[PDB]
Design a protein around this ligand. Sequence first.
Ligand code: NAG
Lengths: 50, 50
Amino acid sequence: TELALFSRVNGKFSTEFQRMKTLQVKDQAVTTRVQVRNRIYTVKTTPTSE
Amino acid sequence: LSNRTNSRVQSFGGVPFYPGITLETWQKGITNHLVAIDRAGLPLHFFIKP
Ligand SMILES: *[C@@H]1O[C@H](CO)[C@@H](O)[C@H](O)[C@H]1NC(C)=O
């Protein structure tokens, strides 16, 4: 606001407001699964075992 | 984001498969590890002959 009276009385009134706002959200979800199965031999009993 | 990786191996005879192996080393590695894969047979009563 600027006001001038009689070309001699001057008045300035300058008001500024400034608002910054920042939000950040980060989510991670890692699921890992490993499943190993070796079946190497098969051991069977002889028919004629004592 | 969404990553979804599913692997699945199945070996039959040959080196115990582990993820970091190459197909060349698996083929070269059946030098001693072999498994029957197809079989032909006869009914058992046919072997009881004079
Ligand atoms: C995993 O997600 C990333 C995202 O940066 C993507 O570039 C990639 O292709 C996805 N898959 C693998 C196997 O990395």
